[PDB]
Design a protein around this ligand. Structure first.
Ligand SMILES: O=C(NO)c1ccc(C(=O)NO)cc1
Ligand SMILES: O=C(NO)c1ccc(C(=O)NO)cc1
Ligand code: NA
Ligand code: NA
Ligand code: NA
Ligand code: NA
Ligand code: NA
Ligand code: NA
Ligand code: NA
Ligand code: NA
Ligand code: NA
Ligand code: NA
Ligand SMILES: [Zn+2]
Ligand SMILES: [Zn+2]
Ligand SMILES: [Zn+2]
Ligand SMILES: [Zn+2]
Ligand SMILES: [Zn+2]
Ligand SMILES: [Zn+2]
Ligand SMILES: [Zn+2]
Lengths: 173, 173, 173, 173, 173, 173
């Protein structure tokens, strides 16, 4: 056992490792999304840029969890990073929906993480989740839904013009 | 076939995808290394910082290959990211040796990539490899060996003082 | 023979002259394209501006090849500059496709030039082509295809609005 | 007929197209001259630079005529660009004389253009020629003759020193 | 064998050592040239300054090759530096011709070095030669020939005035 | 005989040429030393940097002697530059001792040069040696001995840590 470890359960430790894996996977998902829009036959640079930024942020989420793992005297054990469920994301619209879905997945897991933290009465962990992750996830989910809403109203994905103008007017400023 | 595709072989395309996977794996390896030194029972902050920076750079290598894939009208197809061969890296010294080994792996693959590019007479690809990757890899390999050399001379890894002072005097400036 | 000439084949010399002619022709093509969009019954100022800039750059490509010709002690011999294949380019969309086609022509010729350089083992010439021309051409081809892709999706060329908005949102920033 | 067309004769329209061709040819002539002086066995950098600048300006003359063509609702129809009458210009002195001759050619054509404009009472065209072209041509002709005069007096072209010093003292400031 | 060594042939290693020797010799040649023009009975300060600068640059070429030798895990083994073929260079004109000759020697050797690198498929070495040496040599050769050309035309070396004025007007700015 | 020559003996002239050769050799020695420490299996960057700087300075010493040779109307005649006595310098410690030895060699020769100058009552030469060389050599000798002293006390060369820390704390500031 680590010399710094205090009130830090083996159950929490494993769940953190899993969350780490989950954050890294989301990064990989967003990476996949970004360069799809960079394809010459898709060509939506702001969609590409948007998702690439998202991708880097998710890595930042993972890194922040790993330090936390070390802070508590838990131990990081990494697992394989799964390839995304798709290679071709079909459209700006399909990707935003998939991104919405992903974050609800990541968010629920974090909420489950909080429940576990609370059940073990580890308030340091509970506030860490609250402060750095929960509202971010909430915010992320609202933004993606806002994006989803606008794209539908504009006539996406059939109107290629709709996605183009959205790329330009929303993601490029 | 992509409208932009010209003189870009299916063999090159697959090898690029593999190189992409390899660069992402190296990022993950360096990520693993970094936070090991962040463990409370290792506690070498500059080793940690060093490898974290390395990690981000490797991602940058991958991202640069993916755009390139799209530039030529090839198609990115992602594969799983393998977990590193180890969880506990033993020492500053062991990690630098493992990092040396990794880059020789990544570098040889790039050299094999260049051979393939040359055999297919795709000079755009050959110069891309030359310009952005080959000298970087060469440089990376020299630096890690320099690090290896110094650590041995100082009495690493048995002298914990050796690694401490190296962390301080080499990696912290 | 020139006093500066070294390892510079008569075959290379003639091919450079031809490349010079080809770069000047592309300049003329882009010149033709630019002022078509400047017609009162077309009236797409950013298309016009875009192609005019392209035109000047191609001249720059030619000039850079001519100095190179003199650098190696080869001799510049100019040939007539052919008029473009069309006078009326029909649309923003048709022109971008024609521009895509032109650059693939110019790029293949440069790749053939590189093959010739390589067959004669003239690495100065090979790197010159690699460094100043090959990636530029690659980049040019991706950009035009990106432009092509977006215009199709928006409903060009039938939607005159599509071309207008593209002119405004893509070429005017 | 163009919606903007007013008092713009079909005869003027064709003559403008011809003038456009003539300006582009002069650009090509000056281009040829410039890089001759860039040859290693000629090596007069300021002669080279001088003519290259001249070349770009002539293109500017052509471009200004093409917009004008579109302004009046005439239509630009491009023709082949003829190669210059020579490949080897012999000397700084021979080139300046040839340049003097070229501008007198271009200037007379413009004066003939003005006569045509005046005969058709198209004062917009007459002032356009007066304002942007006629005095420039006049100025160009004086300067080349000044250059011619000085070179003769110095002992050009036999004195290679004469041309060298002229290159240095006149064209390099 | 060095720990950093990868795809680096013993043949390349020896040829690099030879190139190192060759670059150091050129430095010594230019050193000899520089101070000849510094003699009171020659007294061409800009010729002197010109060659001295050239000399320092060649050393820089050698130093860059030596680091490269170490980068690849090859080993630097130095050999004697030969005295130049002459002590009295006769004139500004004779020296420029000798310098032209020297660089063609150095350049051919580098081209032979590239051939060897290519035959061993060591693209790192091939691009290193391309990037840092080949165009520089090409450029150097053009400049010396330009200098040669001008000096002949001016009446050098018999006209002492020719060399004086060249020293002043070309090398002193 | 040179027009500027006054009170400048043929014996002095030859000894200056020899001193020139000696200064160039020391430069070459320091060059050899510098890049040894740049080897991956030595890896002492400040030792490398230290000796490289020393090397450039020695060249400066030679150049200053050559101008002086020309100032007096003596004539520079260059001789071959000998390779250093060793290729592998063993250690930071061994090199500093060898450098100490070299400068005592160079310094004695200069002192012998001064004796010759004095015997010929050439006070210009005597003060030139005094002012630009003698104290520099004296200073150089003290510094190297200071370096030698510190390295011994620290436990060099067996303590690889000793040399590392010296590299860091003395040569890197
Ligand atoms: O026929 C004529 N005179 O007998 C005549 C010729 C030319 C002009 C003129 O300058 N028009 O612009 C006016 C009158
Ligand atoms: O044997 C050959 N052709 O018959 C041959 C010679 C040289 C190359 C080459 O350029 N390697 O880099 C490839 C093939
Ligand atoms: Na997220
Ligand atoms: Na809270
Ligand atoms: Na709370
Ligand atoms: Na790497
Ligand atoms: Na290259
Ligand atoms: Na190359
Ligand atoms: Na082009
Ligand atoms: Na003109
Ligand atoms: Na050189
Ligand atoms: Na010294
Ligand atoms: Zn997240
Ligand atoms: Zn990499
Ligand atoms: Zn080859
Ligand atoms: Zn081009
Ligand atoms: Zn004109
Ligand atoms: Zn060189
Ligand atoms: Zn000295």
């Amino acid at each position: 056992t680590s010399q710094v470890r205090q009130n830090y359960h083996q159950d929490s430790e494993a769940a953190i490792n899993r969350q780490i894996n989950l954050e890294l996977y989301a990064s990989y998902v967003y990476l996949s999304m970004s360069y799809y829009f960079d394809r010459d036959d898709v060509a939506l640079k702001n969609f590409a840029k948007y998702f690439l930024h998202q991708s880097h942020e998710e890595r930042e989420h993972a890194e922040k969890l790993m330090k936390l793992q070390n802070q508590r005297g838990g131990r990081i054990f990494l697992q394989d990073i799964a390839k995304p469920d798709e290679d071709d994301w079909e459209s700006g619209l399909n990707a935003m929906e998939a991104a919405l879905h992903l974050e609800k997945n990541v968010n629920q897991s974090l909420l489950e993480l909080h429940k576990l933290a609370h059940d073990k009465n580890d308030p340091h962990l509970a506030d860490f989740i609250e402060t750095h992750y929960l509202n971010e996830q909430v915010k992320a989910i609202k933004e993606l839904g806002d994006h989803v809403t606008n794209l539908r109203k504009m006539g996406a994905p059939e109107s290629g013009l709709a996605e183009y103008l959205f790329d330009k007017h929303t993601l490029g400023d």
